[PDB]
Amino acid sequence: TQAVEAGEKTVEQFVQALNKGDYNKAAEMTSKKAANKSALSEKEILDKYQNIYGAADVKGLQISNLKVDKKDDSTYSFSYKAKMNTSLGELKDLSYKGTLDRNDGQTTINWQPNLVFPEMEGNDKVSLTTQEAARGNIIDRNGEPLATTGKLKQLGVVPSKLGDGGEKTANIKAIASSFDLTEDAINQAISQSWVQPDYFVPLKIIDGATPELPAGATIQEVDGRYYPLGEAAAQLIGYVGDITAEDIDKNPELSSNGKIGRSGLEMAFDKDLRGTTGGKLSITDADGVEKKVLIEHEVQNGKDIKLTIDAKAQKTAFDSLGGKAGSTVATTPKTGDLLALASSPSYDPNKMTNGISQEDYKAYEENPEQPFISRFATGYAPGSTFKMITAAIGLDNGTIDPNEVLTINGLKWQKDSSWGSYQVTRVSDVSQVDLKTALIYSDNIYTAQETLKMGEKKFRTGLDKFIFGEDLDLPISMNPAQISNEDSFNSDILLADTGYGQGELLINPIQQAAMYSVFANNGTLVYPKLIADKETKDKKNVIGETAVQTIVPDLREVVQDVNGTAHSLSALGIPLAAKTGTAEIGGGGGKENSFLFAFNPDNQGYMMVSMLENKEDDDSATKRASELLQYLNQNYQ
């Protein structure tokens, strides 16, 4: 058993070297080239493994059921089952056999071609045929395409037909002025290292009508990924890019010639959209006749994925932001169907997947407003819109009397002199403020007082009945909401700030639309839903129905009362219950975020949560919501 265990260690080190891709380390574990020992030399074994395993993208060689005994005084036989992953799938149940050589004081492997693949002999070759799978489509709730593989117009130039001296400079300026291109960019494209005099040098993709083609201009039809909404859904859908040799090392089942999702849903649903590579991995004879077929299966195209998004609401919600930093979430609050997940500013995903320059990509990454951010999935302080939750909690535990009137003098207020210079600030100097008045005028001092009067324990008890700390079942990279950094505020100031929603709270717009959905389901929290076919999961008795039937009538007045903060939305003439909010936030000035929550209190057909990050002066989310509220009130009742 002394040499048997030394032989078992030799087989394990040989497999481990093949599994790690170190073929030279595995080849040096073989005996000398002979007839009763190894078949090839060490350098020939290296080239055979590197060519065969490299062509099939073999990765993850692991063995089992290893048995090593003894055949002669110096020969030990070994056998084992093995498994490996290739570019066509998993090779399961591979019976490997061989012999060892115990000359000198170390044990080597009598290498044979059957150690590459089980039934290989002599000068047998390995052939791999593959068929690329078509990437599945991403569609909205009504079948409209959001991410599709279609035909594109590739506008390029042939430098031979461009001219010589003077005529070449005139045609470059003619194409640059006819397709809105830079004159120096066309010269740089035709002067790269890969360019030859007659090579078709691609320039840009034409997503419309093709104008007149001057001398040297030509258009060719190529197939690629196309995003109809473009930047309107760039953060949600994402983009796909060319698969690199490093991506194949991570997952061999990818197509070493296709596309892979880099961000958004194209990446979160990459496996379900890319399908499976079809083809056949066969062992051929010395010429080219197949002996045995190892792996073979038909190509399967990627399955289409249907979202709850509305293609027209996603475009309207994005355009309403006007390119400013912000986000908008539109849901059907009774089922959680995410009708729109807009984020602004945004990037062009079509330009991203169809060749983007280093300057345009650097302009996206170094933009101070950061268009790459999925703002609907980024945690923010909910702002003074959070009064609705604090009030509903205050009504459930009997802390807040809807008819009790607090006397507030001025625009600033603090509990004691222990607060130092900090004071809760409000915008409207209303002396007699009750619950309805504080919701109409968005009075933070009222909310700050009722929160301290409620206490931390009773406040967290009502907050814990929501979705704080929960990871939502959504294919969107997202962190769970939090009430504070730790489980205790340990500060009356932080408790009051959390009352009107700007302490250490972190709730992204999707999680906000889930928490605010209780006012459309009589206190029942309906979780958001992005996939059209999934079931509607809900959370009952989050707040009392009494608080819903008390705050929702006041939220109507936030729109209808002439001093309401959302009174500009009464121009719509539709049943609206809204609530505005602001949040004061590395240097800089008053980084203020304008929020807006609004829904239909008559039919609960739609719910909207929009916000503007670092708002400009005189700008607000309420000013930009008139267009989206009309479409949601018309098509979602």
Phi-psi label, residue 490: left if phi above 0, alpha if psi -120 to 50, beta otherwise: left
d(CA 390, CA 445): 13
Of the candidates 83, 76, 100, the residue with the CA atom closest to the CA atom of residue 1: 76
The distance in angstroms from the start CA to the end CA of the chain is 79
Asked if residue 145 has a cis previous peptide bond (ω within 30° of 0), the answer is no
Instruction: Determine the residue type at 228.
Output: P
Other CB atoms within 10 A of residue 186 CB: 21
Of the candidates 574, 374, 575, the residue with the CA atom closest to the CA atom of residue 477: 374
Same fold, 2-122 and 148-225: no
Q: What is the dihedral of CA 18, 24, 28, 32, to 10 degrees?
A: 100
Cβ–Cβ under 8 Å, residues 300 and 333: no
Going by DSSP bridges, is the β-strand pair 305-306/424-425 parallel, antiparallel, or unpaired? unpaired
- Which residues are 297's β-sheet partners? 279
d(CA 426, CA 429): 7
In the DSSP assignment, the letter for residue 481 is B
Cβ–Cβ under 8 Å, residues 375 and 344: yes
Superfamily (CATH H level) for 2-122: NTF2-like; domain 1 (3.10.450.100)
d(CA 122, CA 538): 65
DSSP character string of 374-388: -GGGS-B--GGGGHH
Q: Which two tokens stand for residue 358?
A: 């280093």
Handedness of CA 473, 475, 476, 479 (dihedral sign): positive
Residue whose pair of structure tokens reads 């708002």 in the numeric block: 615
What angle is formed at CA 234 by the lines to CA 250 and CA 301, rounded to 5 degrees? 50
Of the candidates 423, 422, 452, 426, the residue with the CA atom closest to the CA atom of residue 439: 426
* CATH 3.90.1310.10 for domain 230-303: yes
How many CA atoms, within 13 angstroms, populate the side-chain half-sphere of residue 556?
11
The 3-state DSSP class for residue 263 equals coil
The 3-state DSSP class for residue 482 equals strand
How many CA atoms, within 13 angstroms, populate the side-chain half-sphere of residue 64?
6
- What is the CATH code of the structural domain delimited by 148-225? 3.30.1390.30
For residue 128, give every residue at least 6 positions away whose Cβ sits within 8 Å of its Cβ, in sequence order, or none: 55, 56, 87, 88, 279, 280, 281, 282
The DSSP H or E segment spanning 555 is helix 545-560
Instruction: Determine the residue type at 513.
Output: A
Helices (H), 74-193: 167-178, 183-189
For residue 193, give every residue at least 6 positions away whose Cβ sits within 8 Å of its Cβ, in sequence order, or none: none
Residue whose pair of structure tokens reads 């290292």 in the numeric block: 193
> Domain coordinates of the chain in residue numbers?
2-122, 148-225, 230-303, 311-635
Of the candidates 211, 560, 590, 597, the residue with the CA atom closest to the CA atom of residue 386: 597
Other CB atoms within 10 A of residue 567 CB: 18
For residue 397, give every residue at least 6 positions away whose Cβ sits within 8 Å of its Cβ, in sequence order, or none: 454, 458, 461, 462
Cβ–Cβ under 8 Å, residues 298 and 133: no
Cβ–Cβ under 8 Å, residues 366 and 353: no
Cβ–Cβ under 8 Å, residues 570 and 549: no
d(CA 198, CA 190): 10
The 3-state DSSP class for residue 611 equals strand
Cβ–Cβ under 8 Å, residues 144 and 289: no
In the DSSP assignment, the letter for residue 281 is E
d(CA 305, CA 533): 10
Going by DSSP bridges, is the β-strand pair 138-139/305-306 parallel, antiparallel, or unpaired? parallel
In the DSSP assignment, the letter for residue 39 is S
DSSP character string of 283-352: EE-SSS-EEEEEEEE--BPPPPEEBS--HHHHHHHHHHTTTSSEEEEEEETTTTEEEEEEEES---HHHH
The 3-state DSSP class for residue 120 equals coil
How many CA atoms, within 13 angstroms, populate the side-chain half-sphere of residue 613?
23
Cα separation values, 10 from 53, 132, 199, 613, Å: 21, 39, 54, 63
In the DSSP assignment, the letter for residue 531 is B
For residue 101, give every residue at least 6 positions away whose Cβ sits within 8 Å of its Cβ, in sequence order, or none: 31, 37, 74, 75, 107, 108, 109, 110
Residue count (the chain): 637
Cβ–Cβ under 8 Å, residues 584 and 613: no
Fold of 311-635: Beta-lactamase (3.40.710)
Widest pairwise Cα distance in the chain: 104
Of the candidates 501, 404, 393, the residue with the CA atom closest to the CA atom of residue 457: 393
d(CA 84, CA 19): 9
For residue 89, give every residue at least 6 positions away whose Cβ sits within 8 Å of its Cβ, in sequence order, or none: 253, 276, 295, 297
In the DSSP assignment, the letter for residue 468 is B
d(CA 94, CA 117): 8
CA 345 and chain centroid, separation: 16
Residue whose pair of structure tokens reads 């005189």 in the numeric block: 618
Of the candidates 517, 580, 192, the residue with the CA atom closest to the CA atom of residue 338: 517
Q: Which two tokens stand for residue 417?
A: 């002199």
For residue 539, give every residue at least 6 positions away whose Cβ sits within 8 Å of its Cβ, in sequence order, or none: 467, 524, 525, 526, 527
Q: Where are the beta strands (DSSP E) in 350-474?
A: 406-407, 412-413, 424-425, 432-433
The 3-state DSSP class for residue 457 equals helix
Burial 28-46 (b: 16+ CB within 10 A, else e): ebbbeeeeebbbbebeebb
User: Can you state the percent helix, strand and coil of the chain, rounding each to 5?
Assistant: 30, 25, 40
d(CA 156, CA 93): 51
**Which resolution in angstroms does this entry have?**
3.4
DSSP character string of 81-104: EEEEEETTEEEEEEEEEEEEE--T
d(CA 102, CA 509): 69
Handedness of CA 548, 550, 554, 556 (dihedral sign): positive
The DSSP H or E segment spanning 367 is none
The 3-state DSSP class for residue 174 equals helix
Query: Residue 16 burial (CB < 10 Å; 0-12/13-18/19+)?
Result: middle
Query: Residue 572 burial (CB < 10 Å; 0-12/13-18/19+)?
Result: middle
Q: Which two tokens stand for residue 433?
A: 């403020």
Cα separation values, 636 from 110, 155, 316, 606, Å: 74, 42, 15, 6
The DSSP H or E segment spanning 271 is helix 270-274
In the DSSP assignment, the letter for residue 397 is T
Helices (H), 464-503: 492-499
d(CA 321, CA 315): 10
Of the candidates 469, 408, 468, the residue with the CA atom closest to the CA atom of residue 438: 408
- Which residues are 94's β-sheet partners? 82
Cβ–Cβ under 8 Å, residues 93 and 84: no
Of the candidates 381, 613, 390, the residue with the CA atom closest to the CA atom of residue 508: 381
Cβ–Cβ under 8 Å, residues 365 and 227: no
d(CA 556, CA 163): 70
Other CB atoms within 10 A of residue 180 CB: 7
Catalytic residues: 384
Cβ–Cβ under 8 Å, residues 387 and 500: yes
